[PDB]
Structure 1
Amino acid sequence: RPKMTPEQMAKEMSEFLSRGPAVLATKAAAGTKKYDLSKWKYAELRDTINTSCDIELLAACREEFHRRLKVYHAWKSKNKKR
């Protein structure tokens, strides 16, 4: 496989979410972090959603992106500067 970059995955992730819909409303009694895919690799996540059909699952992945996205941008912004 080719060489992967944090900026590349960050762009693919961010846009991935912006592309997906947002008419969700399953919010009930609060509960969605029931799926911990933090370990899943960017390739695994994107892949799963690319070849999956599970609502809850799909959501989990997307959520794992948004999370590691704001964090990646935060830590990066803090690490960038000297």
Structure 2
Amino acid sequence: DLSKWKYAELRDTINTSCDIELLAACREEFHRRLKVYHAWKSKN
């Protein structure tokens, strides 16, 4: 249920929350997005 998160919501959370699991789950989700981007951007 993290895919449906808006960017600025991932961003405000990583930059303000305290939840150890949530913080780590937002990083790896924010990462996953710019990950697949970097992948597609490489070919194109």
Report the Cα distance in structure 1 between the residues aligned to 2:14 and 2:25, rounded to whole angstroms.
10
Task: Give the TM-score normalised by structure 2.
Answer: 0.77
Structure number with bigger Rg = 1
Deviations 1:48-74 (A, max 9, x none): 122211000000100012211221101
Identity %: 100
Tell me the CA shift for residue 77 of structure 1: 1.6
Report the Cα distance in structure 1 between the residues aligned to 2:39 and 2:2, rounded to whole angstroms.
20
Displaced runs of 4 or more, over 6 A: none
Larger helix proportion of the pair: 2
- Structure 1: 5+ residue runs without aligned partners? 1-35
Residue-pair matches, total: 44
RMSD of aligned alpha carbons: 1.3
Task: Give the TM-score normalised by structure 1.
Answer: 0.47
- Structure 2: 5+ residue runs without aligned partners? none
Report the Cα distance in structure 1 between the residues aligned to 2:31 and 2:20, rounded to whole angstroms.
17
Deviations 1:12-55 (A, max 9, x none): xxxxxxxxxxxxxxxxxxxxxxxx41221210001012221100
